[PDB]
């Protein structure tokens, strides 16, 4: 069934599962043509496939060449997402294949269900949670590798860096979603918070700065405060 606040801890049990977010698969800029009409130009995108227990991220880069000569691209993007997710599962050894795939947008259920017909025991689930994974391109190293790609490419990361050496998956996922919620609501401020102190660096093999435990508490407070502010601004409350 659908994933929601009630069954939220299921994400951190030992059944392998993956979130699939397709929001950044088909990305355009909108511009005016010489004659004054509107046209789009595609830029590179990505499927965001994440195991919330381990942090393993399967970033499948979607090169603009995929769209060439295709119609109804927003629809096609859903099927290409499902195609690539299905290929990823096929590429994993059996013991690593997920037992569930949770799609962040309901429009993905039928495309993935159809592409996964060979895996009847992998359950495809929607979610009622409003997850912030669209802000994934606000993480500088992800945006960089997507925009530079010259061909289809799978790049692997751990989205938790080394946090699991010191915290649980539940706390790690809460930290990640908080960081991304912030980046989504006000990227400029969120990013200012993360880098204000030049003495805290990002390891070459990490995505986020190497905050000490105490500094993560201050960070997370600063991200909470950001998110509350923006809300009063949005709704005048």
């Amino acid at each position: 069934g659908a994933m929601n606040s009630s069954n939220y801890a299921e994400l951190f049990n030992n059944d392998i599962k993956l979130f699939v977010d397709d929001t950044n698969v088909y990305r355009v800029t909108v511009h005016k043509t010489f004659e004054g009409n509107v046209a789009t130009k595609a830029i590179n995108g990505c499927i965001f496939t994440l195991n919330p227990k381990t942090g393993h991220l399967f970033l499948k880069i979607i090169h603009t060449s995929v769209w060439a000569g295709q119609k109804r691209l927003s629809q096609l993007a859903k099927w290409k997402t499902a195609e690539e997710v299905s290929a990823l599962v096929r590429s994993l050894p059996k013991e690593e294949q997920p037992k569930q795939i949770i799609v962040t947008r309901k429009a993905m259920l039928d495309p993935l269900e159809v592409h996964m017909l060979d895996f009847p025991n992998i359950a495809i689930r929607p979610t009622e949670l409003r997850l912030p994974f669209s802000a994934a391109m606000s993480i500088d190293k992800l945006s960089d590798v997507v925009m530079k790609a010259t061909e289809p490419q799978m790049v692997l990361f751990n989205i938790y860096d080394d946090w699991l050496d010191r915290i649980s998956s539940y706390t790690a996922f809460s930290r990640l979603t908080l960081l991304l919620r912030a980046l989504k609501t006000n990227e400029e401020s969120a990013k200012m918070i993360l880098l204000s102190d030049p003495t805290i660096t990002i390891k070459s093999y990490h995505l986020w700065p190497s905050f000490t435990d105490e500094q993560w508490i201050t960070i997370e407070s600063q991200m909470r405060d950001l998110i509350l502010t923006e809300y009063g601004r949005k709704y005048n409350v």
């Binding site: 096609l76 099927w79 499902a82 195609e83 039928d110 495309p111 269900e113 159809v114 592409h115 017909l117 060979d118």
Partner: protein, 300 residues
Amino acid sequence: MNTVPFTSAPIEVTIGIDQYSFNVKENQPFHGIKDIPIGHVHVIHFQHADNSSMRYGYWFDCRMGNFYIQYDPKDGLYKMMEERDGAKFENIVHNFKERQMMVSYPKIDEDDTWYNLTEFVQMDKIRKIVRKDENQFSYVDSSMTTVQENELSDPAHSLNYTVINFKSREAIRPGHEMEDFLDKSYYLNTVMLQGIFKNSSNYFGELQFAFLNAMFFGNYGSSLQWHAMIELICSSATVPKHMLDKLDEILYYQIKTLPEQYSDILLNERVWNICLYSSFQKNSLHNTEKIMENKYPELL
């Protein structure tokens, strides 16, 4: 013109023959239905005055034998049976007519309704959906479940309709995932028409039979099958022209004949709105679309 005599009518019951029906009172002297048109399937059905649950009845074709109805007080229902003694049967049928204790199948001569509802329905195909090969006629009732329903208990009593499922390997060629899901022509034309049904007439026959079972017995799994078989055509971009024109006529008479008060449970809003207004064949069902708007605009 053929006859289906009744031994007696011991319990108060509404009897239907095809689209007609009569109220018969407990131990009223009723002894059958005469002037039944040869050349079509027919269905005789029952709903006891005391249990307006479990409508039940029998599909038959009078060219296949002499059939009659007898109430069973052990199993509590009107049973169809075959008389093999042709002499003994004309004898029963003639004495009941002379005594005039039989209703006449009340067909207006201007009326092609039953033909139009049963054009492609064949007794031999019905008997493959309702397997019970010691009888030449077929029992159906409100509660019988289909093979597909069972898969998601007693298989002797199942409606063995052809399983249709839009998210199955059968329906979806590997590598044409998106194409086949959005354009079911492959599934319709190669898998179902050429593969299983062999021709459009057998396809239409099952579709019509499913509708009639839904209409006459409120058989819910039959309603599911009738809608499934419509949707598969309407969701195919490439359909023989003759099937579309014929489908428009089939559906028209089905919609015409449905009791007005039952549109809610028998008609699936999603399927109809998709077929009439969103599908590839939105523009190919003009008569069906016209009668649906002027009779059930609420559903749409």
